[PDB]
UniProtKB/TrEMBL annotation:
Catalytic activity: angiotensin II + H2O = angiotensin-(1-7) + L-phenylalanine; angiotensin I + H2O = angiotensin-(1-9) + L-leucine
Span covered, complete protein: 19 to 615 of 805
Glycosylation sites: 35, 118
First-tier enzyme category under EC: hydrolase
Biological processes per GO annotation: proteolysis
Family: Belongs to the peptidase M2 family.
Topological type in the membrane: Single-pass type I membrane protein
Binding, chloride: 189, 496
GO molecular function annotations of the record: carboxypeptidase activity; metal ion binding; metallopeptidase activity; peptidyl-dipeptidase activity
Species in which this protein is naturally found: Neovison vison (American mink)
Binding site for Zn(2+) 2: 356, 360, 384
Record's keyword terms, sorted: Carboxypeptidase, Cell membrane, Cell projection, Chloride, Cytoplasm, Disulfide bond, Glycoprotein, Hydrolase, Membrane, Metal-binding, Metalloprotease, Phosphoprotein, Protease, Secreted, Signal, Transmembrane, Transmembrane helix, Zinc
Protein name in UniProt: Angiotensin-converting enzyme
Length: 600
């Protein structure tokens, strides 16, 4: 009769149908990831077709029920998520063309090669060959031709495809009643109605801009320390007051600075804590690693893994030449079928990864009772934030002593802690300006504030100003350097890596006060605190049933993202960096470049 009554029955039928078809799609995809065979690609592709064809029919039919006539919030949330459409709103020719461009850009990125200018037979793909150069080489000229060749040979192919990509995607978003494709992506953070828990799409822009201005002091001192250490690694190549050359940052793009750590170890005589040998000396195996990760979550008041987890997960590589995807992943297939697939080895890195991935499973187990459409993180950044904080506590010397991987008399060393915090900052802090500037450029491109004749001009002006990074060779508009990163060429939003990092330290600081942690935040271990786990479970069980502002408030008492917990975590490093940069310039001029030696 009423519109809300009709939609309530519609959503119930949808949930049970989606439960069955999505389960078969996840099961088929799982059977491929654990048994790579052409047949398993076919059965996986059939499962994706039925599930996608079902979702398109149900999404269109959801538009029959006007939201204005729906009053219940839970029915309203499910309906809105289902009414949201994508490429289907375009006419058939524009829809076909966009799919053709998406496939083209993806295959160019995964099959494009750059050839060695000195050895023209050596032409390398990115993922094996070019990454190896950009992640391990210490030679200025070898990193240069890999950085330049990847953008001149592959990036220039993507430039005309990306220009049509922006126009077609902008039309798709506007037909969905958004301003542009950037406003469309920022809808992922939109929360529509509540008791002040609302969140406009424009609010994400301000919160990102506001939190970033507070990051800049810490980043500049990290930038200043890295610069002084890179001048020694590359003599006469880097200006002491200028920007960092883009091809010397540890990867193809400067996304993370982790691989610069061996060039700038604060105290090279102190080795970092590595409990691999203690694991091997105590005869640990992959099963013990996940039993210990399971024990950790039990210590904080969370349940054990299900019987299905232990019987169906692939915790080791099979080794009968069953070709397998070894990327560590946590699977919620539905129907309370939780599995982890990772080729675990007896190391400390996989030990930390096991806690990280099981944290994903704990999240999945928590919101299992929610309706189908509401079984996800509060927003796109919550799941990885929950997983990361698990790795923070499990890696602490306090937690390693309690499980017997460190001696009971183990004494902590500040120089060792500084080595730990710097390596963390090269990964965590170094990526925040990169991520923020990349998404800002995309947002401005989608909006039209950067015309096509200025794409590359504004790319490197923003790279210089915001990131303190300078291109080693001048790039005109025949280039498309942003498209040379996976997430840009493969049509993935990128701001999630920014927000996830803010969220995870908000979670950590909140739970560490509940866990009664005294002292610096980076030493906190939430182990054995059932109050910390019970508070976190309050939010995990919400899934996506409540606004993400509400879910964030339940753990940390604040309704919006706050970078001060992040700065608090790195405050001991901030103090050490400021004293190390006393005789070094902090900041950068945007006038210098390696193709032009001028400071004004
Ligand atoms: C792997 O796939 C092949 C072909 O699809 C199949 O014959 C085999 O039984 C599978 N192995 C396992 C362990 O599922
Ligand atoms: C919620 O809506 C009010 C109404 O104008 C607005 O002032 C406020 O900024 C909104 N909150 C968020 C987080 O967007
Ligand atoms: C988890 O399993 C262990 C081992 O049997 C058991 O002692 C413990 O009580 C279990 N915890 C929960 C919450 O079920
Ligand atoms: Zn993760």
């Amino acid at each position: 009769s009423t519109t809300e009554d009709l939609a309530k029955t519609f959503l119930e039928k949808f949930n049970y149908e989606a439960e069955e078809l999505s389960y078969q799609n996840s099961l088929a995809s799982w059977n491929y990831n654990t048994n790579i065979t052409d047949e398993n690609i076919q059965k996986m592709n059939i499962a994706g077709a039925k599930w996608s064809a079902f979702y398109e029919e149900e999404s269109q039919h959801a538009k029959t029920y006007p939201l204005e006539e729906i009053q219940d919030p839970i029915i309203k949330r499910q309906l809105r998520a289902l009414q949201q459409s994508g490429s289907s709103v375009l006419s058939a020719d524009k829809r076909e063309r966009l799919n053709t461009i998406l496939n083209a850009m993806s295959t160019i990125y995964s099959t494009g090669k750059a050839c060695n200018p000195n050895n023209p037979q050596e032409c390398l793909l990115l993922e094996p060959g070019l990454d190896d150069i950009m992640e391990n080489s210490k030679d200025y000229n070898e990193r240069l031709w890999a950085w330049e060749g990847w953008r001149s040979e592959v990036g220039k192919q993507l430039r005309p495809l990306y220009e049509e990509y922006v126009a077609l995607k902008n039309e798709m978003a506007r037909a969905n009643n958004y301003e542009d494709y950037g406003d469309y992506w920022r809808g992922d953070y939109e929360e529509e109605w509540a008791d002040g828990y609302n969140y406009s799409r424009n609010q994400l822009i301000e919160d990102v801009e506001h939190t970033f201005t507070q990051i800049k002091p810490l980043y500049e001192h990290l930038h200043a320390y890295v610069r002084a250490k890179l001048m020694d690694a590359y003599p006469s190549r880097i200006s002491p007051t200028g920007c960092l050359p883009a091809h010397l940052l540890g990867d193809m793009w400067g996304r993370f600075w982790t691989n610069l750590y061996p060039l700038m170890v604060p105290f090279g005589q102190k080795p970092n804590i590595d409990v691999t040998d203690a694991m091997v000396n105590q005869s640990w195996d992959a099963r013990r690693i996940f039993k210990e990760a399971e024990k950790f979550f039990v210590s904080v008041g969370l349940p054990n893994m299900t019987e299905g987890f232990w019987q169906n997960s692939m915790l080791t590589e099979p080794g009968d030449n069953r070709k397998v995807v070894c990327h560590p992943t946590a699977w919620d297939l539905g129907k309370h079928d939780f599995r982890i697939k990772m080729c675990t080895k007896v190391t400390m890195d996989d030990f930390l990864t096991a806690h990280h991935e099981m944290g994903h499973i704990q999240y999945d187990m928590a919101y299992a009772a929610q309706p189908f459409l509401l079984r996800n993180g509060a927003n796109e950044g919550f799941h990885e934030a929950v997983g990361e904080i698990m790795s923070l506590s499990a890696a602490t010397p306090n937690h390693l002593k309690n499980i017997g991987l460190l001696p009971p008399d183990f004494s902590e060393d500040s120089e060792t802690d500084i080595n730990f915090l710097l390596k963390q900052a090269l990964t965590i802090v170094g990526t925040l300006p990169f991520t923020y500037m990349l998404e800002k450029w995309r947002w401005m491109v989608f909006k039209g504030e950067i015309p096509k004749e200025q794409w590359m001009q504004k790319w490197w002006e923003m790279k210089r100003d915001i990131v303190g990074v300078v291109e080693p060779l001048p790039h005109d508009e025949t280039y498309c350097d942003p498209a040379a990163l996976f997430h840009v060429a493969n049509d993935y939003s990128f701001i999630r890596y920014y927000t996830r990092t803010i969220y995870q330290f908000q979670f950590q600081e909140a739970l560490c006060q509940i866990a009664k942690h005294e002292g610096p935040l980076y030493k906190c271990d939430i182990s054995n605190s059932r109050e910390a786990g019970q508070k976190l479970h309050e939010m995990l069980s919400l899934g996506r049933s409540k606004p993400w502002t509400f879910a964030l408030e339940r753990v940390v008492g604040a309704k919006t993202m706050d970078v001060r917990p992040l700065l608090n975590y790195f405050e001991p490093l901030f103090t050490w960096l400021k004293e190390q940069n006393r005789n070094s310039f902090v900041g950068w001029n945007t006038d210098w470049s390696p193709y032009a030696d001028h400071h004004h």
